[PDB]
C-alpha cells in the first residue's frame, strides 16, 4: 500500500527547488567527470529538462501503439521510471531513447504484463538488425536502470485511487448526480499532471482528488461539502493548498518547442558522438 511504500518515503519531494538541485547536481557531476576525462558542447540543466520532457512524450507515444495492448499501470510505471532515472542522471551520459525503451521493458516485466523480448522489440519501427541492436542495448542498460532506481520498482499510480474516489462519490454523495461525467475531463487533467513534476511532489490520492475537483469546478459544480462532511479545518486548508499548488503546476507547464528540441538533439548527439 502507498502509505508505507518506497515511493512515499524516498521518491516524494518537498519542493521542486530540491528537484532542480538534484538535476543540477547530476549535470555538474557529469561535467566534472568529462573535464577529468580530457566547452560549448555541454548542455545546461534547463536544456536537459527540455529534452527529458520531449523523450517522456516519445515514451508515451511508444506505449500508446504497443501490441499486445499495454495496461495504463505499465505506462505510468515506465514514465515514473523515466522521471526517477533522469532526476539523478544526465542525458549526456545515458541517451534518453535507450533509457525510455529500457523503462518500458522493465515496467512490462515488473507489472506482470508477460511479453517476450522478440515481440517487444518487434514493436519498434526499425529494421530487424536495428531491432536486435536495440534489444542488445536494452539488455545492457536494464541493470543500470534498476540500480539507478535504488531497486524500488513498485510505483503507485493515481488510477486506482481515481476509481475508488468515483465509487465513494457514487455511494455517499447524492448531491452530485452521475459522478461518471467527471471520469472523462478529470482523466484529461491526470494526463496533464503526468507531464509536470507533481508525480515526485505529491501522493496518488491527492492527484486523483485534484483531478476530480478540477473537473467538477470546470463543469460548474462545487464539492466542498464532500471534503468537509463526507471526507479538521487545518487539514482542509492543507488539502486546499495542495490542490492549489497542483493547479499552479499544471498552469505554469510549457511544452518543449520543436526548434529548441532539434537544436538540443543535435547538441546531445554531438555529446554522444
Amino acid at each position: 500500500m502507498y502509505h508505507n511504500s518506497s515511493q512515499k518515503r524516498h521518491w516524494t519531494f518537498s519542493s521542486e527547488e530540491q528537484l532542480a538541485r538534484l538535476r543540477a547536481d547530476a549535470n555538474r557531476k557529469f561535467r566534472c567527470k568529462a573535464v577529468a576525462n580530457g566547452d560549448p558542447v555541454f548542455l545546461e540543466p534547463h536544456e536537459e529538462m527540455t529534452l527529458c520532457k520531449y523523450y517522456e512524450k516519445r515514451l508515451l507515444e511508444f506505449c500508446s501503439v504497443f501490441k499486445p495492448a499495454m495496461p495504463r499501470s505499465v505506462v505510468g510505471t515506465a514514465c515514473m521510471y523515466f522521471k526517477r532515472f533522469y532526476l539523478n542522471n544526465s542525458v549526456m551520459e545515458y541517451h534518453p531513447r535507450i533509457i525510455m525503451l529500457t523503462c518500458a521493458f522493465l515496467a512490462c516485466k515488473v507489472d506482470e504484463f508477460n511479453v517476450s523480448s522478440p515481440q517487444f522489440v518487434g514493436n519498434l519501427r526499425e529494421s530487424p538488425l536495428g531491432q536486435e541492436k536495440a534489444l542488445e542495448q536494452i539488455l545492457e542498460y536494464e541493470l543500470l536502470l534498476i540500480q539507478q532506481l535504488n531497486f524500488h520498482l513498485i510505483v503507485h499510480n493515481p488510477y486506482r485511487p481515481f476509481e475508488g474516489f468515483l465509487i465513494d462519490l457514487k455511494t455517499r454523495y447524492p448531491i452530485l448526480e452521475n459522478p461518471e461525467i467527471l471520469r472523462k475531463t478529470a482523466d484529461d487533467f491526470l494526463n496533464r499532471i503526468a507531464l509536470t513534476d507533481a508525480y515526485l511532489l505529491y501522493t496518488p490520492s491527492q492527484i486523483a482528488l485534484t483531478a476530480i475537483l478540477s473537473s467538477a469546478s470546470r463543469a460548474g459544480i462545487t464539492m466542498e461539502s464532500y471534503l468537509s462532511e463526507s471526507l479538521n479545518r487545518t487539514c482542509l486548508s492543507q488539502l486546499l493548498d495542495i490542490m492549489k499548488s497542483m493547479r499552479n503546476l499544471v498552469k505554469k507547464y510549457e511544452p518543449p518547442r520543436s526548434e529548441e528540441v532539434a537544436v538540443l538533439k543535435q547538441k546531445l548527439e554531438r555529446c554522444h558522438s
Binding site: 500500500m1 508505507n4 511504500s5 506482470e112 541493470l143 531497486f151 520498482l153 513498485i154
Partner: protein, 280 residues
C-alpha cells in the same frame, strides 16, 4: 560481503552464506524481479526482509537475513516431539505473517513447510516470494505444490483470493499433527480423489458453484472420515480451526484475521515463546 559457506542450489538461483544469505534474450529473471519488487514494499517480523540488491550484466544477487532452518526439517525430524504449544506458536507466526501480507493485497501462493523459514531465535518468516502475486483486481491455476493445493485451484480456478493460501495453511497444520503429508497425491485427479476420500465429496450446499470451474469433473460420493477420527489427539478448538481452514467453500473458509480471532489461540496453553521453540 565475504562468502563463508555454500547453502544450496535452486531452479532459478543459488544461495550462499556470506551474516546474510545471498541468492544469485529475456533479460533479468522474472522470479528475481518479482521477489525484488515485493520484498521492498513489505516490512514485518514474520516476512523475510530484502536487505540490499546488486548484480552484474543480466544476473542479480539478493541479500537476505540468514535463516537457520525451515518447518519441513522440523516436521521430518524424528528426535523432537511437537507439543500443542509449539504447533500453536508456529501457527501464530505463520498467520500473523499471512495477515500482514493479505492486508497489503498479496497472495504468497507457495506455502509449504520448506518455505516457512525459521530464525535462530525461533522467529518464523514466509519466504520464496517467486510465485507471490498481488490480488484484488477484476492468474494460473498451476500454483502451490500439489500436496498443498486447494480444490478450487485443482478444479481450474482463474480468479481466487486468500483461500488458496489458507488451504495450504490447513495442510501445513495437518502436517504438524501427523508428521506426514496429509494428502500426498501424484496427479491432479489423484490429489482430488484423496481430498474427497478424506474430507468427503462436497455437495452443492458446501460449495454453491462447484460445477462452474472449467476443470471440474463429477466424482463419486465419499463418506469422509470424521476429523476427530483423523486428528485423534487434537482438541475441540483445534478441530474447529481445522474445519474452518479445510472448508470446501473458499468464500466460507476462514481468513487469517478470522483464524487469529478464534478461540484456539486464546485458549490455554499459550503459544511457546520463540526462544524456546525446538531446534533440529
Amino acid at each position: 560481503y565475504e562468502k563463508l559457506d555454500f547453502l544450496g542450489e535452486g531452479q532459478f538461483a543459488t544461495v550462499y552464506k556470506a551474516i546474510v544469505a545471498i541468492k544469485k534474450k529475456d533479460g533479468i529473471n522474472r522470479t528475481a524481479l518479482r521477489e525484488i519488487k515485493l520484498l521492498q514494499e513489505l516490512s514485518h517480523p514474520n516476512i523475510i526482509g530484502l536487505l540490499d540488491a546488486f548484480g552484474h550484466k543480466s544476473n542479480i544477487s539478493l541479500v537476505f537475513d540468514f535463516m537457520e532452518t525451515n518447518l519441513e526439517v522440523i516436521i521430518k525430524d524424528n528426535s523432537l516431539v511437537l507439543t500443542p504449544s509449539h504447533i500453536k506458536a508456529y501457527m501464530l507466526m505463520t498467520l500473523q505473517g499471512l495477515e500482514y501480507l493479505h492486508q497489503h493485497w498479496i497472495l504468497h501462493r507457495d506455502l509449504k513447510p520448506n518455505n516457512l523459514l525459521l530464525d535462530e531465535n525461533g522467529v518464523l518468516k514466509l519466504a520464496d516470494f517467486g510465485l507471490a502475486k498481488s490480488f484484488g483486481s477484476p492468474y494460473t491455476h498451476q500454483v502451490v505444490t500439489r500436496w498443498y493445493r486447494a480444490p478450487e485451484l485443482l478444479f481450474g480456478a482463474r480468479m481466487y483470493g486468500v483461500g488458496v493460501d489458507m488451504w495450504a495453511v490447513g495442510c501445513i497444520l495437518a502436517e504438524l499433527l501427523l508428521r506426514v503429508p496429509f494428502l500426498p497425491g501424484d496427479s491432479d485427479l489423484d490429489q482430488l480423489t484423496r481430498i474427497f476420500e478424506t474430507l468427503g465429496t462436497p455437495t452443492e450446499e458446501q460449495w454453491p458453484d462447484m460445477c462452474s470451474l472449467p476443470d471440474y469433473v463429477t466424482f463419486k460420493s465419499f463418506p469422509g472420515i470424521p476429523l476427530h477420527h483423523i486428528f485423534s489427539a487434537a482438541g475441540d478448538d483445534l478441530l474447529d480451526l481445522i474445519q474452518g481452514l479445510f472448508l470446501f467453500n473458499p468464500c466460507a473458509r476462514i481468513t487469517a484475521t478470522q483464524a487469529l480471532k478464534m478461540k484456539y489461540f486464546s485458549n490455554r496453553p499459550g503459544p511457546t515463546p520463540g526462544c524456546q521453540l525446538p531446534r533440529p
